[PDB]
Scaffold this active site. Structure first.
Site, mmCIF file in Angstrom:
data_model
loop_
_atom_site.group_PDB
_atom_site.id
_atom_site.type_symbol
_atom_site.label_atom_id
_atom_site.label_comp_id
_atom_site.label_asym_id
_atom_site.label_seq_id
_atom_site.Cartn_x
_atom_site.Cartn_y
_atom_site.Cartn_z
ATOM 1 N N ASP A 1 0.859 -1.173 0.000
ATOM 2 C CA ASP A 1 0.000 0.000 0.000
ATOM 3 C C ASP A 1 0.904 1.236 0.000
ATOM 4 O O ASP A 1 1.491 1.565 1.019
ATOM 5 C CB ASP A 1 -0.941 0.005 1.214
ATOM 6 C CG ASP A 1 -1.881 1.203 1.238
ATOM 7 O OD1 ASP A 1 -2.097 1.828 0.173
ATOM 8 O OD2 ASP A 1 -2.425 1.520 2.323
ATOM 9 N N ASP B 1 -13.365 5.045 1.751
ATOM 10 C CA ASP B 1 -11.898 5.024 1.846
ATOM 11 C C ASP B 1 -11.356 6.453 1.857
ATOM 12 O O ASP B 1 -11.193 7.058 0.807
ATOM 13 C CB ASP B 1 -11.331 4.225 0.659
ATOM 14 C CG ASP B 1 -9.799 4.206 0.606
ATOM 15 O OD1 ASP B 1 -9.125 4.431 1.625
ATOM 16 O OD2 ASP B 1 -9.267 3.946 -0.490
ATOM 17 N N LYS C 1 2.598 11.643 -3.651
ATOM 18 C CA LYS C 1 1.364 11.070 -4.233
ATOM 19 C C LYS C 1 0.337 12.137 -4.647
ATOM 20 O O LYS C 1 -0.502 11.893 -5.508
ATOM 21 C CB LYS C 1 0.715 10.082 -3.250
ATOM 22 C CG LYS C 1 -0.399 9.226 -3.843
ATOM 23 C CD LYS C 1 -0.796 8.123 -2.885
ATOM 24 C CE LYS C 1 -1.986 7.322 -3.389
ATOM 25 N NZ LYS C 1 -2.331 6.258 -2.409
ATOM 26 N N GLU D 1 -7.484 0.763 -4.203
ATOM 27 C CA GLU D 1 -7.479 0.695 -2.726
ATOM 28 C C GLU D 1 -8.773 0.129 -2.106
ATOM 29 O O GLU D 1 -8.699 -0.753 -1.244
ATOM 30 C CB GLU D 1 -7.112 2.061 -2.116
ATOM 31 C CG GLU D 1 -5.640 2.444 -2.304
ATOM 32 C CD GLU D 1 -5.357 3.939 -2.173
ATOM 33 O OE1 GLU D 1 -6.261 4.712 -1.791
ATOM 34 O OE2 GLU D 1 -4.218 4.344 -2.477
#
Length: 518
Positions: A6, A196, A68, A173
């Site tokens: 992850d 999420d 990211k 994810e």
């Protein structure tokens, strides 16, 4: 052995399926998650993870984090320009992309693609696994947000390649989280909603899960909504407060701004279990101290518009799936920001008092699912049954006359998938035909995201309208587009060029060599 990683905005996590179960692997500091931080010291050492985060406030300009939030984006993306205000490292334009410039000791400057920073984080996660397993790791399943676009997906895959990983599959994810929830369930068909909300991106996915068969029916998200925005809101509140009270603007003092970041992070964590938190900075600005009390009520007030905006994707997913609130059998919360009491409250209230599923760690469930997927794809037989149908998040379309979004592949289509269309020329002897592909749900292309401009080249001389070129648009199982062309005339090689400025094998090789210097 293939691992699941992850790769998260604020933290990363690595797991492996071995001996019939998932192990989440602790790093060399004993921590099951690792900060997604890279720093360069005055003496020329590269730090990654916990050690990098620990020296943020003393060496802010050369401490890199939140890569990211920049990866796979263009320079003029408002998400990039809005975030620059809160990042201490210089962000500079190169090849229409936001590059990161740092000092590597001895007055020497170096510029990195966001891909290269994420490759350094992936390398640290790989090393964590290699230490535990006692052998080299060359293959991984790597996570992305469900709502990541084509460029963000490819850039994440490139980060893996730079890190010496063959990326077996990139996994969305919420789908990974659903696997962690649903593996070895034998209940027949259930509708599962995964909410999420992590450090940088927000996804909602509705899945059916039925005895080892997982299908994403609908997904919707916001790739620039997460924990870092909640910290930003509080940071900006206190920067403006200080300016009002003292006249002094601290927005360009990187030590002041990142010391405030450190305190806001601590405060936010405290406010998940307490109703007040103390912000205290000793050498804040020009010798002077800074002390403030942040109540939970004020933290919630400063972020309430962002918190309430998380219901917008939830309603979009219910509409696309044609389900009502009462059809949702389980709510799975993942991502660190789902620990915020107000987020939990808003989700519970939206679904009329329904409690979320128990036994799921929101910091680890995504890595868990990625690790299972890696094991399954490797050929393991001690893993639970797993058949996965996942989707493209965005409608792909072509720009037509009047700036019109002509739909080609709709959102929520199971991948891999393809669509073909015949193109011809507008003028006699025209050698090139240009196609502009967009991502998004609006009727006009100016309100959607340009994926790329593709040129059909080497069209042999002929009168206008005679050439017949079949162009195929394929989205692969990773969610990435490939465009190819074939001449279907009565009798040439049609090569396609694009403006995506993709990292070439030559460029990746150079980046691998640059990283070996540390």
């Amino acid at each position: 052995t293939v691992v699941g990683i992850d790769l998260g905005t604020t933290y990363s996590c690595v797991g492996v399926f071995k001996n019939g179960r998932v192990e989440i692997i602790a790093n060399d500091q004993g921590n099951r998650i690792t900060p997604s931080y890279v720093a360069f010291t005055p003496e020329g050492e590269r730090l990654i993870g916990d050690a990098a985060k620990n020296q943020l406030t003393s060496n802010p300009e050369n401490t890199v984090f939140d890569a990211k939030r920049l990866i796979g984006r263009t320079w003029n993306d408002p998400s990039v320009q809005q975030d620059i205000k809160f990042l201490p490292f210089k962000v500079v334009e190169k090849k229409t992309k936001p590059y990161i410039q740092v000092d590597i000791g001895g007055g020497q400057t170096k510029t990195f693609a966001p891909e290269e920073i994420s490759a350094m984080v992936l390398t640290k996660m790989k090393e964590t696994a290699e230490a535990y397993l006692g052998k080299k790791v060359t293959h991984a399943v790597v996570t992305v947000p469900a709502y990541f676009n084509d460029a963000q997906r490819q850039a994440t895959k490139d980060a893996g390649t730079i890190a010496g990983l063959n990326v077996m599959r990139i996994i969305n994810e919420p789908t990974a989280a659903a696997i962690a929830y649903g593996l070895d369930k034998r209940e027949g068909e259930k509708n599962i909603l995964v909410f999420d909300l992590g450090g940088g991106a927000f996804d909602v996915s509705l899945l059916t899960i039925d005895n080892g068969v997982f299908e994403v029916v609908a997904t919707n998200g916001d790739t620039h909504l997460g924990g870092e925005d909640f910290d930003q809101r509080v940071m900006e509140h206190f920067i403006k407060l200080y300016k009002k009270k003292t006249g002094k603007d601290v927005r360009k003092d990187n030590r002041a701004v990142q010391k405030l970041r450190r305190e806001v992070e601590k405060a936010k964590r405290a406010l998940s279990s307490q109703h007040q938190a103390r912000i205290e900075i000793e050498s804040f600005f020009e010798g002077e101290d800074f002390s403030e009390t942040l109540t939970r009520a004020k933290f919630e007030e400063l972020n309430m518009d962002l918190f309430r905006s998380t219901m917008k994707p939830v309603q979009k997913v219910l509409e696309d799936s044609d389900l009502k609130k009462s059809d949702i059998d389980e709510i799975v919360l993942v991502g660190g920001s789902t620990r915020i009491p107000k987020i939990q409250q808003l989700v519970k209230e939206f679904f009329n008092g329904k409690e979320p599923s128990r036994g799921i760690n929101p910091d680890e469930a995504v890595a868990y699912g990625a690790a299972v997927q890696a094991g399954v794809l490797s050929g393991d037989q001690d893993t639970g049954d797993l058949v996965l149908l996942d989707v493209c998040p965005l409608t792909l379309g072509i720009e037509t006359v009047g700036g019109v979004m002509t739909k080609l592949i709709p959102r929520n289509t199971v991948v891999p998938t393809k669509k073909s269309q015949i193109f011809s020329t507008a003028s006699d002897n025209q050698p090139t035909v240009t196609i502009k592909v967009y991502e998004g749900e609006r009727p006009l292309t100016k309100d959607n995201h340009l994926l790329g401009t593709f040129d059909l080249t080497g069209i042999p001389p002929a009168p206008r309208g005679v050439p017949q070129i079949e162009v195929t648009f394929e989205i692969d199982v990773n969610g990435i587009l490939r465009v190819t062309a074939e001449d279907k005339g009565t009798g040439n090689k049609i090569t396609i060029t694009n403006d995506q400025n993709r990292l070439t094998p030559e460029e990746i090789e150079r980046m691998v060599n640059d990283a070996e210097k540390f």
